[PDB]
Every structure is written in structure tokens, then in C-alpha cells.
Amino acid sequence: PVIRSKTSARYMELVGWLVDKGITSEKQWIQEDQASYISFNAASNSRSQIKAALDNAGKIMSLTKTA
Amino acid sequence: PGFYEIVIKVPSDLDEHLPGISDSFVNWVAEKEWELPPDSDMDLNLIEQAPLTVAEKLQRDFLTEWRRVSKAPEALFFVQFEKGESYFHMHVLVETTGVKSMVLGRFLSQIREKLIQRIYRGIEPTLPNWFAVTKTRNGAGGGNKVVDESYIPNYLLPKTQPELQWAWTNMEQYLSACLNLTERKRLVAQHLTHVPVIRSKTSARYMELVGWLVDKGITSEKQWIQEDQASYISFNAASNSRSQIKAALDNAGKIMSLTKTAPDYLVGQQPVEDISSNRIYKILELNGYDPQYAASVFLGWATKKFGKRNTIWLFGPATTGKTNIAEAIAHTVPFYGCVNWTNENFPFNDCVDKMVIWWEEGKMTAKVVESAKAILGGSKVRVDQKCKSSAQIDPTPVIVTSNTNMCAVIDGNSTTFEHQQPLQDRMFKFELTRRLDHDFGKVTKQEVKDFFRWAKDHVVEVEHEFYVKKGG
Amino acid sequence: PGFYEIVIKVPSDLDEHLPGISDSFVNWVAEKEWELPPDSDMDLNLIEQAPLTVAEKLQRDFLTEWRRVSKAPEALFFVQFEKGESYFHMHVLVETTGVKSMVLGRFLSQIREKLIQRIYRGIEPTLPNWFAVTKTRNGAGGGNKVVDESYIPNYLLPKTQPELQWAWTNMEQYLSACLNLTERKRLVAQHLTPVIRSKTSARYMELVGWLVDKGITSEKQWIQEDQASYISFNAASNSRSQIKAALDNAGKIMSLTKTAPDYLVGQQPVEDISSNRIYKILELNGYDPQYAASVFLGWATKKFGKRNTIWLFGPATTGKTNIAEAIAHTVPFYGCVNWTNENFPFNDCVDKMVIWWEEGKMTAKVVESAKAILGGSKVRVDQKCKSSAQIDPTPVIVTSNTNMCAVIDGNSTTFEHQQPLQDRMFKFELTRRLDHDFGKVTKQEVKDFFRWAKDHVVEVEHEFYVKKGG
Amino acid sequence: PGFYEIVIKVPSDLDEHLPGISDSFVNWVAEKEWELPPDSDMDLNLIEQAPLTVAEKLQRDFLTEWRRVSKAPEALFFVQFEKGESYFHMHVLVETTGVKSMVLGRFLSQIREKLIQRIYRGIEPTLPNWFAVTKTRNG
Amino acid sequence: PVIRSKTSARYMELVGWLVDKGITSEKQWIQEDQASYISFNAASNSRSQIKAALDNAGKIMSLTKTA
């Protein structure tokens, strides 16, 4: 299935925009744009979301795409 | 433009929901037959008849009352008659033009009363909350849910023939998708293919606080109180505000770890009007060195302008116009670290995750001479740590303030001089032999800031050499 | 000088937009040919012929009528004949000289009627809104838009062949940019080149302020000053989620801001120093109380640096602990260095203003950090079950009876770090024992001693042995 | 001493707000000019012309009608013409002496009728409530 | 400063009754009035409040009263 909501669509768009630039960890986020980083880090549920997004992007890049 | 999701339950059982209804109403509702348009692939057998007419009358009266009470006949709307699992309802949508959130409650009650007095003719439906508006939270807590245009293709259009019955809307972008599954599916697919930040009153202030903190140079709780104790206390009243302090501190640290150059924080803002009063000026003029040339050399060394020769070495006994300036610089910069010359295995243990490498009364070691030459010659290298993993040390301006000849690189229980020329061709020799008086006073951070700023107001041609020109 | 943006649609299809037009007009529209200037890179094939004549006549008559209704023949203008996606239009621009913004509709209608009666000969174009003025807001609620000279190179000049057909203007700076893409692009490239208010936070701020004013060190003093407040703030659902935070915040605020000398300075002057217990202890032992008082004044005010430490050496029960017992009770916060714990000896000394060392014994595990702490130098040390913390230069006092220079290292001792420690303290020789009727030192006695010290300042010489009493 | 906050929305477009206006009015509004007084440092280029004359005529007739209906020509007042982003609005203030809050509405209606029958020459501006008084609550 | 609320007043009355009746442990509460003990031991949050009030009463009696 593909549940949708106001909190999941933003996360989907964020991960889709991140995987395009090849984000590795939080270090690359500040290099690209710290404004968007602090925007999401301002919330309280983003701490547990960024850690999962990093691993998800890593696992995706390694299984689908090739160097 | 936002919209309000109004829920209007369509009475399914006219005998139970509308006890005592006149027979004329039921006759007129049952005699009205409907037929889908010619270009409509929807199956009419699944769609009802009397409930369809009831929903049509209800939504028509609702739209009429809304246009009459809001004075906005050109307002957009989107009605969709569906069939719930146990009762019929409608996902009515009306724009917020001319109707604020603090007046919607009264208009809803007025429209409900008008519908009960006109359609049902006084008889009020006995359904659990037959007329209400979607809220951001269940109960009387959350407020009116002001959805967006993306809510239509995200919940209404995805529904197909089984749950769909009819729909009415004046928007030009959802005209053919009223009674056509193909158009609805096409719009849903287009919306999914089309699809970042979030705007909130609680995050907007945090985004400015994190930017003001880095501007003021705060990297801990003491620095926050140094500016204003009341301001710091205001941002730590509740647990949510307390965790915010730690989050902001961590983010500010990780950001400062990736600025662009150290001088970005050391260089002052406003110019200098009296440099003679600065202690650095007197320290440089007493040892026999042109303050202007020394300031230019310091600016070029801190800005990574020399590259290979981007290093300064203050010679002469300890505390001779060498230790005071270095201590002031270390106290001014956010983080610092003293090179542990005693620990030849991991002398850079204290210089981990630091912006400046300070060598206070310490001799050069041969165990980290090759790796240190890379950072001194403008090159990156990942050195080890004391019981910790390695870490890349980007080209950072190193400052040496020792008394013994640094060329005598020690290699354990002996001494060598093979690294004399290699280390001398990438450092500046500052023969600061003059000793400061007991009443000289320690240099402050504002003094270092003013010195670094004046270094920019009076720039001179800095020559890449070993021996720095003295004050003639 | 501003300009008015008046849109004028050019009827393309003369049969549909101008029904009933005479054949003579169509003949003139189709016969009049046009040709770009010699220095024009635009393609004439893409530019239509019939609409160009109509646009030229329209703009000419419009300028002629404007120069008459405004009384400004030398006014600047800028016309650009373009081609929309489904209808032709012109971005006519006229200066605001002569004609105002409020009295514009009348002149516009008059010019439209004249243009009709002249070119179209009574027949009015059937194009929806074929003659109007660009408003400041999309709708029936906005005044006439008054653009500026910068509006041309930021909207009209960027446009290209698929859009443009012709343009007319008298400005010396925009003549070559009317029928030339190179000049248009050149001009386009040259012109472009926290606090928070809340009822739940105000109470917390007021509580922090009251605690800082009264000076609540630990939780015990809270109940002493007020019990109802501690009961109310503890009755909350979170219980003890804010009490400890407020205590730590107040402690840190009072430590970083104020210091011990702020309170050690006595208020009123000393009336009799001989009656003080510290003075008697210092005099009976054969040491000039004046130098000791000056040393204490300079030590709290961290004015010695390396030698910013006192070492009251002597046998036990010789007026050594009696002074520290009062010095620690007078100051707000106090601690004790645990010499037995070689790993974390500074377990109790956490954010304290005065560090008292009772029967201290230097160890090899903290011989480096000790030299920096006692010597008035910033240094970071690892805390017990807590992160590291920098102990800023703080007055430290020792009251041991053994040799502090002896560095213990398990089942042995080394005197390598003897001179560094000897050159950073003030050794004493207090051998006289105090009687039972001497009594302990009070809190006011320390303040009186500090006041007498400030009242009698002498040169403090960096000597190992303190000057004895002559 | 209190004052009544009166607001007058000057027609931003006479052709759209005042349909059928006489030609003499437009001619007088266009041909009329003004200059900066001696003790004035405001740029005349930024200040409009026709709106200035319109506001002057409006405030003059309003003050005359108020002094005639109140029988207090020596009363205080304060008129200030503004230039809004969407439309032009005037801020008129009159003393609350000799005029109660009840008869204030009747006097306002009377002067409005006089203005629409004399100034506008029987033309009602299309702007919503072109003339009214500010209340203590938006509504 | 003092927070005002029903729970605050209830806790104040509780600690007052405790320090008046000389209660210092859970045994004395049952010895005097075993009904209030079971009444306050129902809610989960009240269990921590009981210990907090006990400690507060003990400290208050140690600071004010003497041996």
C-alpha cells in the first residue's frame, strides 16, 4: 500500500530531493544548505527521522543505482 | 488558497433519521431520477437514486447559503458525494475567501438551521453529528482544518466507483473528473508524479535563534548567559524548550565545524580608531617589528593566503610577547587545543575538532613530523588519535610559541635535524626576545579582534620568506 | 520619469474582429509593405505584414492624440508590437507628463473613440477588452500602474522573435534595441548586471530571579527560605523536572557572573582587628598579619597568577582548619579535593568559588592538571561520571600537615615536581596550638579580615616563605 | 477632549467610481495646480495633483457642513489625506463638544446626503461605504 | 513566585497534614489512617508524589524541629 498524509508527503519529497544530490550524512547537508537542515531540525520528531532517512537513502543508492 | 472540509451526513433511512416526515417529500425525492452524462464510464447500477437527489439538494442549498452569507459568488468549491461503511456523507470543500476561521462556526450553524427548516422542514436529523466540520484534532481541542488544493487529489480523487457516487465542483482543473474514473485516475497519477520545508510558528523563531547564536558566537550554555541571562532562561522553561537548547547547541557546533575560514569569526566588524592602546601593538613594537607588517602577516596566515608557508613561529624564551597573544587568540576563537609535546605518540589529542592548533612551550616530535608537514604545507591528511579513530584535519593556521629551537626535532631518546629546512621553508621566524613587564596585563579578546580588523584596513605586500622584516 | 502601460489589441482577422469593414481598408492593409532597417538581424519572414501596418497606424494615431491631450509633444514613449499566443497586442508606453493617474480613463476613451472613427471608420473591434490600461492589481480594485524606465529592459527587451514583430520609440538609448536582437540582449544583460512570551515561562523567570536574589545554593536552603514555594513547584505533575534545572542555572549564573570577592569584601570597616580569630592565629604563629591579609586579598582577586595559592603548613590543630571552615561556610558554594581518589579527585569541587584542600597529597595521576589549577590557569579535566569541564582560575587553599611537594604514585614517592609546586604556593609555619576557649571562626570574621586587607595593601613579593613577624 | 475618527474614501477612479461625471469637474480637477508652502520640505513630484484637489474640496465642504450643523465654527479639527496601496482614504477628526453619540449618526447621514447631492452632483461612488465613521470594533 | 492550581493546593494540604501528624514513613500512614494511603496509592503519578511529600516533610522537620 502507499498511505499518504501531510507529514509523509514532505518526508517523501525531502528524501527524493536528497537522493538526487547524493547525500551521505549530516555533514553534506550543511555543505549543500544549512537552512533546510535547521528548518527540519527545529521540530521534535526530526531527530528520529533524519537517522532513518540517512540509512534509507544509503540502502536505496546501493541496491537500485550503480556507480 | 485554503479550504474547509465540511462533513454533512446524508440521511439514508428517512424513517429512522427523519421520523414523521411528510409523504410528499419522500415522493418527490424518489420520483427524481438521475442519469450520468454521455461521456461517463461510471456504472449507474452501483449508484443510488434517492440518496443522490438528497445529496444534490443538500449541497446546492449549502452552496447557496455560503454564497449568500460570504458575499463571494466567485468562490471555489469541491463537493463529493460518497457512501460510507455505515452511513452516507459528503466531503464538501469551500474556500476561505471572505470567511475567517473565527466566523465559520456561526455560519455552519446558520446553514444547518436553514437546511433543517427548508429541506427537512423543521425535523432535525437524528444522526450522530450529522452536520460538522473537519478539525485538526478530534474533539473540541483542535481547530478548523484549513486544507490545501493538494487535498483533493490526495483523498477524494483516489476513491473510485465503489466509494464514489457523485461530485460537484466549479474548478476548471476538476471538471471532467466529476463523473469519470479515467480522468480521476489520470489526475491522481499526475499529482503523484509531480511530488522541501515546513512553515510553523514554533520553527520560524528557532530558525532565527540558531542564526543569531552563530552570529553572536555562542557554543555552550555559559556563552548564552554571558549575553543575557533572561534570554537563556526563557528558552529553557519546559522540557521541550530544554531539549531545544541541546539541539540548537549541537546544530550550531556542527555548522561552525563547516563555515569557510577561521578569520570569518576572528576578524572584527567595526574598524579600529585607536590601535596604539592595543596590547598587541605594544608587544609587536617592543620586540622590534613593524606592527603593520606583523598584522598583514597574521592576516595572510589566518586566511590561508600563503598556502605552503601558512605558518607562524614565535621564537625567544617563554612569555616574551608570544604566550600572551596566543592565549588571547585561544580564548577568542570558539575551540582550541594545546599540542601535548610530552605525548609523542598522540600529541594532537587536545587538538581534536579544534579550529586552531596552539603549540605552547613544546618541542617538535619525529613521530608526527611527516603528517604535520602535510597540514603545514597546505595539504589534508587523516592522523590518528589517542584511543580514538582518525579524523581529517583540513589546512588550519598553526601557531608555535616555544623557546628552544624547533629545528631540533626529537625522535624519542635522541635528536635529529633532518627536518630542519623542510620545516623552516614553511614557517615564519619571529625573534621576540624582549620580555614583557610584570604590569603589562593580559590581552583580551576584543584586542585580538581589533588587531585582526586593523590588519585588513592597512594591507601591505607580504613577501613569502623565512625571516620577517623588522621595524626600522 | 514613470510611464503608463496601456495594452491595445491589434485586430488580426479583419473579417471576424471588424465585421462589415470596407474593402478599401483591407486593400490598404494588404498593399502597404514594410522592410526592416539595413542594420537589422531580425527575420522578415517571421514578421507578419498585414498586422504590422495596422499596428503602426494605431501607435502613430495614439501618439498624435496623446501629444495633443497632454500638451507634451517632446514626451518620451516606447511602443512594442508583439504577437500573443492567440491575439496581437502592443505594449505602448507614454510618459506621465501632462496626464495624471486619476484623469486617465477619460483621455483613454477619447483616444479610443478617435482611433476607431479614424482607422476603423466607426466599426468598433469585437475583441474582448481591446483597449484598457494595466492596473496595479488583477481585479476591479487597483489604481493605474505607473512603471519606470527599468520596466522596458526587464520585460519588453528580453522577448524574442517568436514574440516580437516591431517596435517604435524616440529615446536615443532604445533606438537600436527596437529592431535588433543583439542590442536587446546587450541591454538586458547590462541592466540586470529573539524572545518568547508565555505564562508558563514568566513564572520560571521570576523564580530564577528570586533565587538569584536570595542566593539559594542547594535544595536545603530552598526550604529554609520558603517552604510553600518548594511545595508548590514540586506538586506539579513533572515533579522534579524543573527544580534541578533552575538550581543549576542559578548556580552557573552566580558563578560566571559574580565571584567570592564580591561578597568577601566587608561592608562596614573593621573596628578592632586584634579581636578577630584569624588575626590572632596569624600573630601567635609569628607571622605579620598584614602580609597574610594582603596575600589573601591578592589570592581571592586572582592577582598573583602562578603564585595564586596559599599553603598553610604546620602540625594538626594549629589554626589551619579553623580558618577554612569559616571561609567555606561564608562563600555560597564550596567543595573539597579528594586526594584519595586519584582518578577524579575534584568530585565535590564542581563550579565552586573557593576550593579548600584538607590534608591534601599530590599524586602522579593529577600532577599536570593540579599545576594548572593551583597555578591559576585554565585546564579541562574529566569529571566523575560526567563530561569534562574547564576549571577556570579559582582561589585554592591548602591546610595539610605533610609535605605537599611529595608526589605519591602507588607504593613509592617521587620529588621530581618539587620546585614547580614550591614556586606556586605560600608556605607557612603555624606550630602554636589554639586553646579550647579560642572558639571557631564566624562568617563576619572573614569579611572583616578581607576589609582590613583591602584597607592595608602592601607589596606582595613572590617568595617561597611568607614574611614572618618581626 | 475626545474626537470622532471619521474616514472618507476618495474615489480613486472618477471614470469607474463616478460614472457620468460632468466635464467641468474633470476640467477643474485637471487644470488646477498647487505648490509647496514656504515651510514645506516635501517633494512635489511624489505628491499627486488631482487627488490633492479632490481631498481639499472634500475636507473643505465637510468642515463647512459640520460647522454649520453644529453651530460651533470655533471648534477644533484635524484632516489628513492619505494614499493607500489599494485606494485613497482620508482621516478626518472633529471635536466631541456639542455633538452626542446619538445625533452624530444623523448629522453624518445629513452631511453625506448634502455632499452626494452637491459635490458628486447626484453620483454615488461605487466604493463600499465611501463615507462612514470608525467604530470600536471591526464590524 | 508560587504556582496556583488544584493539584498544588492538594499537595500542600497533604504535606501539611503529614508534617502535623508527624508522619515519616509508609507505616505511620497506615497506622494513623489507612484509607488515605490506599486512596492516594491508586493513581500511578501519585506514587511518586507520595515519596516526594515524605522527603519534603522529613527535610522540613529536620530543618525546623530539633532533637
Side-chain angles (χ1 to χ4, degrees), chain B residues 418-461:
Chain B
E418 191 176 350
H419 323 288
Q420 173 158 320
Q421 217 73 46
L423 284 168
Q424 278 187 352
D425 298 339
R426 300 183 170 74
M427 297 185 179
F428 301 138
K429 191 160 178 192
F430 279 84
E431 302 196 322
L432 309 174
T433 54
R434 222 295 196 171
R435 214 163 192 170
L436 310 177
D437 305 315
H438 66 282
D439 66 336
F440 207 98
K442 291 187 177 201
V443 176
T444 62
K445 312 178 202 198
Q446 197 74 49
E447 276 167 304
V448 188
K449 287 182 178 185
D450 299 344
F451 177 70
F452 270 76
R453 176 53 171 191
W454 184 72
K456 182 178 170 182
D457 302 325
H458 303 72
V459 191
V460 296
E461 191 171 4

Side-chain angles (χ1 to χ4, degrees), chain B residues 30-45:
Chain B
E31 282 173 344
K32 172 52 168 165
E33 299 200 328
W34 292 96
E35 291 186 355
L36 293 147
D39 58 320
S40 182
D41 63 343
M42 290 182 78
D43 191 5
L44 192 71
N45 299 287

